[PDB]
Amino acid sequence: RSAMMYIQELRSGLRDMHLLSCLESLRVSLNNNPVSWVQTFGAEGLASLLDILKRLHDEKESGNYDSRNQHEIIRCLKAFMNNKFGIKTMLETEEGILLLVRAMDPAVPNMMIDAAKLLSALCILPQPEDMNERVLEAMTERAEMDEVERFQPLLDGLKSGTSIALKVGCLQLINALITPAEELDFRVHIRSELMRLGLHQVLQELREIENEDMKVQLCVFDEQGDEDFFDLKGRLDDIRMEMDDFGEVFQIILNTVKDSKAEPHFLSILQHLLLVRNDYEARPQYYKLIEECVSQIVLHKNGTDPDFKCRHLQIDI
Amino acid sequence: RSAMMYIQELRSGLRDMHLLSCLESLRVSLNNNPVSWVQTFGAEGLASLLDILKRLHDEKEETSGNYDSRNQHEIIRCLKAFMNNKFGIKTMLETEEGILLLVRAMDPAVPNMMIDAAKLLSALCILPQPEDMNERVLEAMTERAEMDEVERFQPLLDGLKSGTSIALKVGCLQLINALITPAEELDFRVHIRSELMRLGLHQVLQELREIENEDMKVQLCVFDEQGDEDFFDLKGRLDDIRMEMDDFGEVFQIILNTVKDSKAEPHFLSILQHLLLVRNDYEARPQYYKLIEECVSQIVLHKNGTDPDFKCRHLQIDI
Amino acid sequence: VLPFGLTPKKVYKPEVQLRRPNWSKFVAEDLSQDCFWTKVKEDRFENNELFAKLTLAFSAQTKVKELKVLDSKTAQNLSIFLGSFRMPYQEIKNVILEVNEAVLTESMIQNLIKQMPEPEQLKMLSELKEEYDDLAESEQFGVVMGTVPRLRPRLNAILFKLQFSEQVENIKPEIVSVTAACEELRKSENFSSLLELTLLVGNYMNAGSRNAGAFGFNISFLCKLRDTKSADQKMTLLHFLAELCENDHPEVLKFPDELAHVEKASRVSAENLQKSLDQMKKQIADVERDVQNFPAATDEKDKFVEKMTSFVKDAQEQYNKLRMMHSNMETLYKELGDYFVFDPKKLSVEEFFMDLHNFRNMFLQAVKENQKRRETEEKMRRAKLAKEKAEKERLEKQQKREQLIDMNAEGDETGVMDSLLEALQSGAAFRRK
Amino acid sequence: VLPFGLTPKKVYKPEVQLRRPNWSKFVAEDLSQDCFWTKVKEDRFENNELFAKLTLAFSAQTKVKELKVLDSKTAQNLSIFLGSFRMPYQEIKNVILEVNEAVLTESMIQNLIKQMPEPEQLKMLSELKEEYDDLAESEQFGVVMGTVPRLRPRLNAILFKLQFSEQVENIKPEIVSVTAACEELRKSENFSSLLELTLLVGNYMNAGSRNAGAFGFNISFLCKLRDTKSADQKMTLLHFLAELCENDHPEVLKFPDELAHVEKASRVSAENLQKSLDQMKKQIADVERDVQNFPAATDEKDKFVEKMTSFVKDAQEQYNKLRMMHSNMETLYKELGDYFVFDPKKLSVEEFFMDLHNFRNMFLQAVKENQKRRETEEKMRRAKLAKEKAEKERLEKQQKREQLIDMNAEGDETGVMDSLLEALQSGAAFRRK
């Protein structure tokens, strides 16, 4: 119909509020025409939307008002992807998921909200294969061109000054990245990266908020970490069954530690084990408390690594 | 001179006040008279003192009020005056119950006797000859504890508790030190200091640091000193292990040999199993082993030369 | 019949036939009165459904056409062969004549040679052409193969062709190995440095004997070095030489690494290489002479003479490159023979390099043994010093405590106890050091 | 004089003589122009002050009287023997006649026997008794020993005596070991039960042929049990039996402990106990004859007739206890033959208790092979259950995320995203388990 007119409008090089007025009515057309109409705008039309965005994202200097333009593109993208074609079409662009990630600027909350909301929906898709890993891959790509932490944007959207809805959308993406992932190591690896960046002190603040959408997300993040602990508890039982021979287990530890920075430490541990003083009654209790301490460090609940910066440990009963 | 007659006076079986006036003049003799006089008193009169002492001890068929524990304290003063010379020391040690009955004399309920009794044992402990002296004193305390069904250090602990007196608080810590400091092998000094902590010394010790007594600070400072020596020696024994045991297979065998057929076997196996859970991340896995190591080094190479408390939980890390 | 004082053992009827022990059985009248096997009429003493658990583990379950020429053996062999090959007899012929490289295999040609009737029979079958239909399976193959000219040589040539690019990869790697080790031994001045070092030590030891002032020694003697040891049988000459290189000439210890291809040379065959090439040369000239006597191709399908002319130029091109490498390798070994002065004809290549390999390993052995012995000297020196350290300090403690009570032949003093408590209670009676 | 373009190697003169490598050297002119050993006119390229160190390790440092009777064979040997003995000749004689128990040992006597000149030469020496001082050391000994009546017999009896209690402790333990094992193997009803169990299981497998319904089998066959195995070749009859015991009859597992002495009897030679008792009886009968044929003790010191009769009484007493046990032992073996039905004449006692000992060890080995193998089963069955359970839970979680969106092919409508975003908000996208 009039779809080609929009493409010709976008490729013509409009600016400021002209570019805005057009994109606004394009969002309307996208949201109100049949699915038929979106397909004719198609890969061609999306490509230009993304080109315009790629131009805008290249910002060098208080701030640009063209965040209205950026956010309005994100809005078209939602409308475009509001039907099965749009999604599969966006997943095919080389820079679509990346440009969304770049639009997660905590300094413009409402855009990040809408962007992180799309990225979350992509994450929990069945096809193609490992969607979450692609979304994560893109976050890493953005993190290297900026020289920051790939999760800094997300954590920043969670800190106390930020709006309550940004906080939800943020933790929503967190769960979108963790939950669909199948391998235990990968879930714990990512969660431990979040804690490393400072997620723990934040979640404390977040639980006290009585917002329904928020409470739901914290429930999911809790549930997804409680699962991992169970699977780890399970993994431990598999070990306790297969590894019942002193020589065999000890060989496996050497085989995994050999030629890694972890090697000197293991010898150091064993050298200490010689020190447990020679006394009939005190010795087995040293080995129990040692076992207690190693049990706590290894089988850390919440499905996270222990904080390796934390310099004090309680080792209970 | 007149020593042979003090022996007869003891065996005629004097009681109540008549015995006390006998022992009080005997003490006066044993102090002011020369060395030669006490030798002809010697083993005979001493084993009488220790038999009347043994008699009065088995008068414990009533508490909350005794009639003749004033006699007991006089014998202790006699034994002090007796042991004031080198022969008496030598002769005392030869008796089968001379030391043991000096230990049954230690009672927190009646302060003054325990001060003098624990002061004699504290002297015996720091003796060069013969050999393992402090250990004999310990054996007596153990022997006493057996027949009473109580913990062997319990009286020493009860005497330290703030309810008593300042002279007794010191006198008990003095014997604590006197039992620990002469002992040469580490595994013993620690083994005993750990028995003191389990009985709850650490709680009590932090109350005695409040008291502004000089004779008290001396004993705390000496106790603290000897406790630091032990840590230092344990740290040196750690260095010897680091330089002699550097093969994995050899070290693991040694532990295995030490742990075989005990109750620490199940625990050592479990430690190794748990090590197989330290996540398979290139970066986290070293940090796992470092933290584990770091924790262990605080459990085993524990400060002040005592076992960690096995009924509690908690641990900090450097520097 | 009624047996010797007891009643018959029940007849079982099994479902599955099981595997059985074949013991020497005892029947009724083998026993005696008081023997063990009479008391055990107790077959009931143990009875279950294990009979069903046992049968589980131990079950053992799962016209026309006459001959005219061929002998009973050959015709039979072909009958099993042709009921497996399944290719048409006209097609078999065509694959041979064309030498079709997509169809032919090493596996395929080899089987033809074995299963083939021999020239005399093929000739005798070639005269029955007209009655082809009345013949048997095997003889049909026979007549068809009969028309192929010079089949025995033709097949022998096809086989060698398909087999050629294999035996190239058997000779070359072995040639290269020996070539390299020869160059490796010659180049290494660290091994050279050991021989010098060994001779110097050697010349001094021979004092004024039948040896001494030797300008060298045979290189095989290197393994004999270990044989000469110290008076105390605790260290050898080889151990000495290693340790003297460990301390004063570290460069030397790098030679077992300089000799990488020596092991692979220790495993080759001098004679079998010559055998293999001489067997190849004859096999090239076999086809070369078989391509000269061949009759001119009388159909459009005979691609032998064309294709095998491409092979012989190609095969001789590769053989001559091998013949080069080989005689070069032998030159290099003759070269080592003169450089280190040893008879290259009375000691084979594998012989030499095995001795050299053995010595190489003997040498590392000596080095490991030395670091191991030396570590046991360091951990025994310090350990005895850590004992002399404690014993001196233990006597230092005793000499401080005895300075209060003197035990030898004393007199009198009633102080003592007063002197004990004056320090005990004042804290001095607890030394530092 | 003068070699091929070079100078002779320095002539050394060491202090201490050293052990040396005896190698085939190369003299001046074994070398050619371009050889390696010509380049090494160096000899300095590796010079130190190691000669000290080398010498240290390989240093190899640290008329009267004529013979009248005896040959120089015996007259020389005695000179050495008497050099080690140092005992007065007139005392040795007295210790022999008295049989002085405190001075005499098995070693001492055994030397005398060996060193003594034969009775012919002792006689010829006791005819020269007067001229005692003119004789040599060796012959002086002889003149003393010549006056001892019947020496060769006297000394033999003394030896057998000093050797008697020692050789009883060679027969006895072994007589007991075979007695015990014969009685343990007779007492063991756990062993018994194994046979009963084996027979049944065997009787069933033997189906309907040669052996079947057999009343017994030969105890020998016990080791051959391991030789019957499953068709899949995974496990043996022994194993099955062992497993049958392990589960259904745990009592049977105790039979290796009931046969305590069975090992010790596997090692005792049956033929050597027979020889030993036959020798002991002989040696007794020897001293018996000696005592009867002895002259009257014509001096106060000759205690031989006295002490040897006191030894024959005792040596015969202990021997009859020994024989009783042996004949008892042999009975109990023949008893076993009759009981378990086997020819005791064709299998020696060691041979029989070896087969038995071996079987014990096969059974105990089969028992741990059953445990280890069964342990492999339970772990591998738990590991696959936990993996089925993990995979089941995993699929359930997958489907719960797929009930969101049909990425399949259905008609295009505009819910999709607004439908995903709602499930994100409510938590429906993050289903649990």
Numbering used by the authors:
A (entry chain A): 134 to 194, 197 to 452
B (entry chain D): 134 to 452
C (entry chain H), D (entry chain E): 745 to 806, 828 to 1198
From the paper:
Formin proteins direct the nucleation and assembly of linear actin filaments in a variety of cellular processes using their conserved formin homology 2 (FH2) domain. Diaphanous-related formins (DRFs) are effectors of Rho-family GTPases, and in the absence of Rho activation they are maintained in an inactive state by intramolecular interactions between their regulatory N-terminal region and a C-terminal segment referred to as the DAD domain. Biochemically, the FH2 domain potently nucleates new, unbranched actin filaments and remains attached to the growing barbed end of the filament as additional actin subunits are incorporated. The mammalian DRF Dia1 is important for stress fiber assembly and cell migration.
We crystallized and determined the structure of an “N+C” complex containing the N-terminal DID and DD domains (DID-DD) bound to the C-terminal FH2-DAD construct. We obtained crystals of the DID-DD protein in complex with FH2-DAD in space group P21 and determined the structure by molecular replacement using available structures of the mDia1 N-terminus and truncated FH2 domain as search models. The structure was refined to a crystallographic R-value of 23.7% (Rfree = 29.6%) using data extending to 3.2 Å resolution. The crystals contain two dimeric N+C complexes in the asymmetric unit, where each of these dimers is in turn composed of a dimeric N-terminal fragment bound to a dimeric C-terminal fragment via interactions of their respective DID and DAD domains. As we discuss more fully below, we cannot unambiguously determine the pairing of C-terminal FH2 domain fragments into dimers. The tetramer has approximate 222 point symmetry, and is composed of two symmetrically interlocked N+C dimers, as illustrated in Figure 1B. The tetramer effectively consists of four layers; two FH2 dimers form the two central layers, while the N-terminal dimers pack on either side to form the two outer layers. This interlocked structure is held together primarily, if not entirely, by the interactions of the DID domains of each N-terminal dimer with the DAD domains emanating from the more distal FH2 dimer. An ∼85 Å long α-helix (αT) extends from the post of the FH2 domain, and the autoregulatory DAD domain segment is connected to the end of helix αT by a 10-residue loop segment. In the present structure, all four flexible linkers are disordered, complicating assignment of the connectivity of the FH2 domain dimers. The DAD is composed of a core helical region with the sequence motif “MDXLLXL” and an adjacent basic segment with the sequence “RRKR” in mDia1. The interactions of the DAD domain with the DID are essentially the same as previously described for structures containing the isolated DAD segment, but additional interactions are observed for the basic C-terminal portion of the DAD. In the tetramer, the FH2 domains pack back-to-back, with their actin binding surfaces facing outward (up on one FH2 domain and down on the other in the orientation presented here).
